[PDB]
């Protein structure tokens, strides 16, 4: 297959994505939710993990780790400790507003994903770590979990299979770093959201020291559709090692910002001009796109012309997919102001545990706040580059990467703009 995207409505997994149907159980069973879940539960963990591994599902949290390989680490016998699934519903990332839509509009598919993933790894309970800001979505999901308990779907003898499974909802308290999986685990246990190191991975020591899998809402909710429709159906979309569909979020400077499910390797020009109405001012007006939300380095219009919106092609575009949160920035934007506001976001949302993030993100924000006005000289650009190279790979979790990589993308693609900004500073202020 040569071109990707242009996905029909019969192959959309997230039907009722826009809330146009009833989100409750009577509408859910009219859309294929909770249908033949008993035949998924009776066929054991090995068949479910085989159907997920055949489907080629990479991690929809943003790093693309193989989700069948991630859930297969939990295929181990217990030694007194129970096992747990945690469904990361935090979603504190700018540009990223897809898992909130899954909570608000497709809740029963998320609870079915909790049940299928809990059978898949022998997980005893499901702690959906929802964001604290999503209170109306939290009560939305709680009414849906009440409808899932009263119909015998979750709880004692879940869906008639001889398997007992609970689904808990734990609200956060407004912290971006509680979306990172180890600080999420620390946030469940009643402490500050400070990340653990790796190893021990959460499959070894996770929540309360129990073996635990933290999986994103989008990679949890698609897994019953993976078990029902088959692995090869879900695998035929997107390129090789880029299987599945993805909930893109086109925000920023577009005419119609929107969350849209699309086939994986869709071109970005096709996506923005078809599903969002193009950049405000057309494709002529597009300056730079932050391809997947605030953690990945931006690429300009010259590279957005031909690039494919999956993991590996954007890695060839020296960026990351992340959450597939396309932030669009036209010609009339001071991009240094936007990147310095983004670094100010990464210093207001950083837990201050280890040295390079705690000191360097504040120091890069001070340098970028001087760069916005231009109160510096060009030799402080490359110094800043080294500061990113002294944060990337020296920290515990990947907020150091998420605060270094936009600075790297900005320097690498707009060094002449920074130089001309600071030299016109030095000529008009002295």
């Amino acid at each position: 297959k040569t071109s990707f995207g242009s996905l029909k409505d019969e192959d959309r997994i997230f039907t009722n994505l826009y809330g146009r149907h009833d989100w409750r159980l009577k509408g859910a069973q009219s859309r294929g939710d909770w249908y033949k879940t008993k035949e998924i539960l009776l066929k054991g963990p090995d068949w479910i993990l085989g159907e997920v591994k055949t489907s080629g599902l990479r991690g929809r949290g943003g790093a693309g780790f193989p989700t069948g390989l991630k859930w297969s680490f939990m295929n181990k016998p217990s030694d007194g400790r129970p096992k747990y699934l945690v469904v990361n519903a935090d979603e504190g990332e700018p540009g990223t507003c897809k898992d909130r839509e899954i909570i608000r509009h497709d809740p029963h598919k998320l609870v079915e994903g909790c049940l299928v993933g809990g059978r898949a790894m022998g997980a005893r309970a499901a702690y959906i770590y929802i964001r604290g800001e999503f209170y109306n979505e939290a009560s939305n999901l709680q009414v849906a979990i009440r409808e899932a308990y009263e119909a015998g779907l979750i709880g004692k003898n879940a869906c008639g299979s001889g398997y007992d499974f609970d689904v808990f909802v734990v609200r956060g308290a407004g912290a971006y770093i509680c979306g990172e999986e180890t600080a999420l685990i620390e946030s469940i246990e009643g402490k500050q959201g400070k990340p653990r190191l790796k190893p021990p991975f959460p499959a070894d020591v996770g929540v309360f020291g129990c073996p635990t899998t933290v999986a994103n809402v989008e990679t949890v909710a698609v897994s019953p559709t993976i078990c029902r429709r088959g692995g090869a159906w879900f695998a035929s979309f997107g390129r090789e090692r880029n299987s599945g569909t993805k909930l893109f979020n086109i925000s920023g400077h577009v005419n119609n910002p929107c969350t849209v499910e699309e086939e994986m390797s869709v071109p970005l020009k096709e996506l923005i001009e078809k599903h969002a109405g193009g950049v405000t001012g057309g494709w002529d007006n597009l300056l730079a796109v932050i391809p997947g939300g605030s953690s990945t380095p931006l690429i300009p219009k010259s590279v957005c012309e031909t690039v494919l919106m999956d993991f590996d092609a954007l890695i060839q575009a020296q960026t990351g997919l992340g959450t597939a949160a396309v932030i669009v920035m036209d010609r009339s934007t001071d991009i240094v102001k936007a990147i310095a506001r983004l670094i100010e976001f990464y210093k207001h949302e950083s837990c201050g545990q280890c040295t390079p993030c705690r000191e360097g993100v504040d120091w890069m924000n001070k340098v970028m706040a001087r760069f916005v006005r231009g109160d510096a000289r060009p030799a402080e650009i490359d110094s800043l580059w080294e500061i990113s190279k002294q944060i990337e790979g020296h920290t515990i979790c990947a907020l150091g990467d998420g605060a270094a990589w936009p600075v790297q993308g900005l320097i690498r693609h707009f060094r002449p703009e920074l130089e001309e900004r600071m030299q016109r500073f030095a000529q008009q202020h002295q």
Binding site: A379, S383, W385
Partner: protein
């Protein structure tokens, strides 16, 4: 240097050299005691990039 030219001629005759070319007493030709303020340069390691210590 304020010597009379009779004593100057006697002195240049007795030494056999041109002593007023090279006086060992210093006068107004030497430098001033109150100098302008300097501004010293910096070394080659005053750099903000590719300036790790192990190199």
């Amino acid at each position: 240097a304020s010597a009379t030219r009779l004593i100057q001629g006697l002195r240049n005759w007795a030494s056999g050299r041109d002593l007023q070319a090279k006086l060992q007493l210093r006068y107004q030709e030497i430098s001033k005691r109150t100098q302008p303020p300097p501004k010293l340069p910096v070394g080659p390691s005053h750099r903000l990039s590719n300036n790790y210590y192990c190199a």
